Amino acid sequence: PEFLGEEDIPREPRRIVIHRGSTGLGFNIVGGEDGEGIFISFILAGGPADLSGELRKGDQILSVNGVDLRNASAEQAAIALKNAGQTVTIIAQYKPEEYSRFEANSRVDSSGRIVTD
């Protein structure tokens, strides 16, 4: 059989367009201290972000609708995302090493997947 898990998670930036009307995007963000970045920590099953199938825990949010968030604070990042409108254009980049700093007992394996012991 041909298992996905062995395959490396792409590390280059991607464009994700989520259409969520007037409901939550369905994911959590962490970070936003001293320009450490804004990262996805949790995606809600069945939510708009999940239904896109193009975002994952450990993704850094680089921008929303053209607004650079690489250096944003967590609160202003949340404000930007919550007020982004019905159609939300995210530029994300998978940064599992930087993300693993946040979640207890986490680490990155050989394929780039975030593992928690």
Partner: peptide, 7 residues
């Protein structure tokens, strides 16, 4: 430090 928000 830290903060986590649902969006």
């Amino acid at each position: 430090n830290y903060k986590q928000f649902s969006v």
